[PDB]
């Protein structure tokens, strides 16, 4: 079984409005949130904050330099979900294929994220994707934790 799955929530201090509003129509803010992980965010086609716009990420992982270019599979603007494939980049080195769910829950006084993962690796041998479940976390801290009072 190459197929796997990833499940990670946590709970945020932040405003889950405003993390969707980032995820959704303006992920380039990540870039100024989270400077070390991602570098860039640069839109290719479409629209912002719509189904079958294409995302271009230029980001860092133990100190290299990756990329990826994603499409926006489903947004969900009720459950506050959206859903990235990745279309190309270092990750299919790997993964035959990859999918990115960040869903936020806005009720009701907690506010949480949850990143779901699912992959499919093309060896056996090929590692979970820890490393990158990791860094979506610290990518969240650091969008919560920004400009704080
Ligand atoms: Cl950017
Ligand atoms: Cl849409």
């Known amino acids: 079984d190459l197929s796997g799955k990833m499940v990670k929530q946590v709970e945020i201090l932040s405003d889950g409005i405003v993390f969707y509003e980032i995820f959704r129509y303006r992920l380039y803010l990540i870039s100024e949130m989270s400077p070390v992980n991602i570098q860039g965010v640069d839109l290719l086609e479409g629209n912002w904050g719509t189904v079958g716009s294409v995302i271009f990420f230029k980001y860092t992982i133990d100190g290299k330099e990756k990329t990826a270019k994603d ?3 489903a947004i ?3 459950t506050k979900s959206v859903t990235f494939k990745i279309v190309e980049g270092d990750l299919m080195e790997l993964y035959k294929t990859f999918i990115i769910i960040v869903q936020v829950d806005t009720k009701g006084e907690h506010n949480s994220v949850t990143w779901t993962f699912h992959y499919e690796k093309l060896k056996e041998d090929v590692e979970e994707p820890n490393t990158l479940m990791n860094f979506c976390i610290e990518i969240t801290k650091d969008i919560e934790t920004y400009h704080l009072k």
């Open 71 to 73: 499409i926006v599979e």
């Open 76 to 78: 969900d603007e009720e």
